[PDB]
């Protein structure tokens, strides 16, 4: 239980500061852990920064009418993408981009939608 | 005190078919949506209709009516969408209504394929802001499919609701907590009501609450927002006699109201008086609980004339009228007395005390 | 409810009063000893008892509708087990 933990968050603070309040209170959950309590707890406050991400992902297709500059947001968001719970987000466009460079066919104009390492994703393979 | 103010029914429409789901417009709150079954007696006529009410001028008929192939089952406005009026049906399939456009019949409409929905989807909603948003839709047979509003032939996400490993869930009715897009409560048929997440690690079915006897016939999570945070409460109401309060935190129902004769179809939290909720029996009564004022007898009562059993309840936006629609299809609507719908300033920690209680 | 501590307190009162006795003591003098307090007991018990009854007339005396003072009765239903509580009840009960 200790490894999956230490696995997930030492992935999720080297990364996130990748892409104040969001670091403050991360690095406070990882305080408050060093036990069913202090994981509940700890993946309280993850999930509640997770949906606030969401809300920036979901501004992400507010902000931008053409591929170009949403394809900018998501090279800014990298962190993201080993975390599966913003990948229902980002999943949501990925359908639309990659149809939309699928239909231009641009190496670099899809790896950036699928993020690093896009070999293993089943989409990508093709 | 409640009191009778707009009784709504079209004798060529709304005649033999019960009110499968009533909705409120967010934008042009004086509209209210009402879907119906199939008539029994007619086969000509088509299955499912659709009509959408106005409170506004005295006009008798609907404001526009609309119509498909099969029964509508839910009905919603697409909350950041004016033009538009969604709904299911039970042939599990999403049908689009646009008031623009002078089709009747739907102008898009979902598959009936695998992806896609197959039985019938008791519950759809349009969740996310306004910059970006998504209809949830939740079938019988658990599957729950995300869909955009401007295209509706592919599916935008697909996945089934299961727990215990492998056990389908029967979502009967399902709603979401105010300001939350990823946490949901569902009732079942199985008469457990399960706390599902639409995106995570644990996508799914993440809690079960135990404790009721019957199908679960309505979810409805807290609505009024205020000084102290109640998001996590929700009403249930189910065919064992019952609505019960439920808190996402605890596994066990936080309370249980039945001072009822028959089954409980559909319950709903006033939306702005925190305590208040109102409760649609079988036998015609439309019961105001007001937890603050008195928690074992409902706060107030009122019969529809002739006592048709009442299938669904749904408060206006502004809390102080409340539509309920019948078996017979007449859609009353009844305005809430001073005294029990706005809310006093203390009404906030007054629940708070009464959930102290409890 | 003032009434329920001062029931609480009392009781345990009389079970301080009647654990000062040595009972272990056998002889006149256990047996005379042992004899009072057991009277102190049952006399301030009977009396915790009608303190008790006072709760049960205040049930009327604040439940108006049927499911009320039904859960008052449920509530209370392990007191109900006592001898003099249960006859005190009985135009409720009807």
Same mark, same amino acid.
């Given at each position: 239980?200790?490894?999956?933990?230490?696995?997930?968050?030492?992935?999720?603070?080297?990364?996130?500061?990748?892409?104040?309040?969001?670091?403050?209170? @991360?690095? &406070?959950?990882?305080?408050?852990?060093?036990?069913?309590?202090?994981?509940? $707890?700890?993946?309280?406050?993850?999930?509640? +920064?997770?949906?606030?991400?969401?809300?920036?992902?979901?501004?992400?297709?507010?902000?931008?009418?053409?591929?170009?500059?949403?394809?900018?947001?998501?090279?800014?968001?990298?962190?993201?993408? /080993?975390?599966?719970?913003?990948?229902?987000?980002?999943? *949501?466009?990925?359908?639309?981009?990659?149809?939309?460079?699928?239909?231009?066919?641009?190496?670099?104009?899809?790896?950036?939608? &699928?993020?690093?390492?896009?070999?293993?994703? !089943?989409?990508?393979?093709? | 005190? &409640?009191?009778?103010?707009?009784?709504?029914?079209? *004798?060529?429409?709304?005649?033999?078919?019960?009110?499968?789901?009533?909705?409120?417009?967010?934008?042009?709150?004086?509209?209210?949506?009402?879907?119906?079954?199939?008539? *029994?007696?007619?086969?000509?006529?088509?299955?499912?209709?659709?009509?959408?009410?106005?409170?506004?001028?005295?006009?008798?008929?609907?404001?526009?009516?609309?119509?498909?192939?099969?029964?509508?089952?839910?009905?919603?406005?697409?909350?950041?969408?004016?033009?538009?009026?969604?709904?299911?049906?039970?042939?599990?399939?999403?049908?689009?209504?646009?008031?623009?456009?002078?089709?009747?019949?739907?102008?898009?409409?979902?598959?009936?394929?695998?992806?896609?929905?197959?039985?019938?989807?008791?519950?759809?909603?349009?969740?996310?802001?306004?910059?970006?948003?998504?209809?949830?839709?939740?079938?019988?047979?658990?599957?729950?499919?995300?869909?955009?509003?401007?295209?509706?032939?592919?599916?935008?996400?697909?996945?089934?609701?299961?727990?215990?490993?492998?056990?389908?869930?029967? @979502?009967?009715?399902?709603?979401?907590?105010?300001?939350?897009?990823?946490?949901?409560?569902?009732?079942?048929?199985?008469?457990?009501?399960?706390?599902?997440?639409?995106?995570?690690?644990?996508?799914?079915?993440?809690?079960?609450?135990?404790?009721?006897?019957?199908? #679960?016939?309505?979810?409805?999570?807290?609505?009024? +927002?205020?000084?102290?945070?109640?998001?996590?409460?929700? @009403?249930?109401?189910?065919?064992?006699?019952?609505?019960?309060?439920?808190?996402?935190?605890?596994?066990?129902?936080?309370?249980?109201?039945?001072?009822?004769?028959?089954?409980?179809?559909?319950?709903?939290?006033?939306?702005?008086?925190?305590?208040?909720?109102?409760?649609?029996?079988?036998?015609?009564?439309?019961?105001?609980?007001?937890?603050?004022?008195?928690?074992? @007898?409902?706060?107030?009562?009122?019969?529809? *004339?002739?006592?048709?059993?009442?299938?669904?309840?749904?408060?206006?936006?502004?809390?102080?009228?409340?539509?309920?629609?019948?078996?017979?299809?007449?859609?009353?609507?009844?305005?809430?007395?001073?005294?029990?719908?706005?809310?006093?300033?203390?009404?906030?920690? $007054?629940?708070? $005390?009464?959930?102290?209680? #409890? | 409810?003032?009434?329920?501590?001062?029931?609480?307190?009392? !009781?345990?009162?009389?079970?301080?009063?009647?654990?000062? /006795?040595?009972?272990?003591?056998?002889?006149?003098?256990?047996?005379?000893?042992?004899?009072?307090?057991?009277?102190?007991?049952?006399?301030?018990?009977?009396?915790?008892?009608? $303190?008790?009854?006072?709760?049960?007339?205040?049930?009327?005396?604040?439940?108006? =509708?049927? =499911?009320?003072?039904?859960?008052?009765?449920?509530?209370?239903?392990?007191?109900?087990?006592?001898?003099?509580?249960?006859?005190?009840?009985?135009?409720?009960?009807?």
């Amino acid at each position: 239980q200790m490894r999956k933990f230490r696995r997930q968050h030492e992935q999720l603070r080297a990364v996130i500061v990748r892409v104040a309040n969001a670091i403050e209170e @991360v690095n &406070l959950a990882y305080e408050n852990v060093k036990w069913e309590a202090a994981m509940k $707890r700890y993946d309280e406050r993850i999930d509640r +920064v997770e949906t606030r991400i969401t809300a920036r992902l979901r501004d992400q297709l507010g902000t931008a009418k053409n591929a170009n500059e949403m394809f900018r947001i998501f090279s800014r968001f990298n962190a993201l993408f /080993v975390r599966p719970h913003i990948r229902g987000a980002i999943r *949501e466009y990925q359908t639309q981009l990659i149809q939309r460079v699928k239909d231009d066919i641009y190496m670099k104009r899809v790896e950036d939608v &699928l993020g690093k390492g896009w070999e293993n994703h !089943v989409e990508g393979q093709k | 005190k &409640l009191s009778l103010n707009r009784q709504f029914f079209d *004798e060529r429409w709304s005649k033999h078919r019960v009110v499968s789901c009533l909705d409120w417009s967010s934008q042009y709150p004086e509209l209210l949506v009402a879907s119906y079954n199939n008539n *029994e007696d007619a086969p000509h006529e088509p299955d499912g209709v659709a009509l959408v009410w106005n409170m506004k001028y005295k006009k008798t008929t609907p404001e526009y009516v609309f119509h498909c192939q099969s029964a509508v089952m839910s009905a919603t406005f697409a909350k950041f969408h004016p033009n538009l009026v969604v709904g299911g049906t039970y042939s599990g399939q999403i049908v689009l209504w646009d008031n623009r456009s002078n089709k009747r019949t739907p102008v898009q409409r979902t598959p009936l394929s695998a992806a896609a929905h197959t039985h019938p989807v008791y519950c759809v909603n349009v969740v996310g802001t306004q910059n970006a948003h998504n209809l949830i839709s939740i079938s019988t047979d658990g599957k729950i499919c995300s869909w955009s509003l401007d295209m509706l032939s592919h599916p935008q996400d697909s996945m089934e609701l299961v727990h215990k490993q492998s056990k389908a869930v029967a @979502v009967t009715s399902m709603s979401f907590p105010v300001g939350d897009v990823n946490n949901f409560v569902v009732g079942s048929e199985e008469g457990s009501v399960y706390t599902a997440c639409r995106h995570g690690s644990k996508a799914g079915i993440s809690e079960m609450f135990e404790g009721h006897q019957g199908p #679960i016939t309505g979810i409805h999570c807290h609505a009024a +927002v205020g000084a102290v945070d109640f998001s996590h409460l929700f @009403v249930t109401s189910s065919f064992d006699w019952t609505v019960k309060l439920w808190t996402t935190k605890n596994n066990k129902p936080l309370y249980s109201f039945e001072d009822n004769a028959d089954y409980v179809y559909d319950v709903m939290w006033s939306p702005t008086h925190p305590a208040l909720f109102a409760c649609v029996d079988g036998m015609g009564r439309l019961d105001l609980w007001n937890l603050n004022n008195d928690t074992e @007898v409902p706060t107030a009562s009122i019969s529809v *004339e002739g006592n048709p059993a009442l299938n669904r309840v749904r408060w206006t936006h502004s809390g102080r009228e409340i539509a309920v629609g019948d078996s017979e299809g007449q859609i009353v609507i009844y305005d809430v007395g001073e005294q029990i719908a706005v809310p006093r300033n203390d009404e906030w920690a $007054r629940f708070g $005390r009464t959930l102290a209680e #409890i | 409810d003032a009434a329920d501590a001062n029931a609480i307190e009392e !009781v345990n009162l009389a079970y301080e009063n009647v654990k000062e /006795v040595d009972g272990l003591d056998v002889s006149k003098e256990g047996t005379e000893a042992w004899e009072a307090a057991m009277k102190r007991y049952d006399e301030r018990i009977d009396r915790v008892e009608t $303190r008790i009854t006072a709760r049960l007339r205040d049930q009327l005396g604040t439940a108006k =509708n049927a =499911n009320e003072m039904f859960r008052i009765f449920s509530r209370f239903n392990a007191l109900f087990v006592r001898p003099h509580i249960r006859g005190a009840i009985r135009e409720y009960q009807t």
